[PDB]
């Protein structure tokens, strides 16, 4: 019980892979887990690191995220390099 309590002490890192009747959508779940853990590191830079452009398309498509200049500039530099 003490170990479980210490685990929950940092529950930000832990994330549950929702069964979702076998969603088999691994990249998006990984990205969500990394974003939650982070609380610079951006989902855009990671997506650029991978070759998945659809993931970044979904990330940017949602209007919830509001982007600044340097935020996109760094990702653009990464994509160019």
């Amino acid at each position: 019980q003490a170990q479980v309590e210490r685990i929950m002490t940092r529950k930000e890192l832990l994330t549950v892979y929702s069964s979702e009747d076998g969603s088999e959508e691994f990249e998006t779940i990984v990205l969500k887990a990394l974003v939650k853990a982070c609380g610079y590191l951006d989902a855009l830079r990671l997506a650029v690191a991978w070759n998945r452009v659809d993931i970044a398309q979904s990330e940017l498509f949602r209007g919830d995220i509001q982007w600044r200049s340097f935020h996109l500039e760094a990702s653009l530099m990464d994509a160019l390099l």
């Binding site: 498509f61 949602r62 209007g63 919830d64 509001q66």
Partner: protein, 87 residues
């Protein structure tokens, strides 16, 4: 992206003539004047799907104009992102 500054008390006939002839825009077979405050930057998934799939698609098919507020806020931002995604 043609811009213009004009007084509110302006006859719309001159504006329409300028848009149609000088700026090269064809006559609109249909005009959709989109309204809606849409409090909160986020918008529902079904509404966004409708805009990007129902409104913008129809506008391109019929060569219609979409009249909104030319600002990066409110429903104007949602309409703009729908247009961009459709493109």
């Amino acid at each position: 992206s043609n811009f213009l500054r004009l007084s509110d008390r302006t006859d719309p006939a001159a504006v329409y003539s300028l848009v149609t002839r000088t700026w090269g825009f064809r006559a609109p077979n249909l005009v959709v004047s989109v309204l809606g405050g849409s409090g909160g930057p986020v918008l529902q998934t079904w509404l966004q799907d409708l805009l990007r799939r129902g409104l913008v698609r129809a506008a391109q098919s019929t060569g219609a104009w979409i009249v909104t507020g030319g600002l990066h806020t409110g429903i104007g931002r949602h309409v703009g992102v729908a247009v961009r995604d459709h493109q």
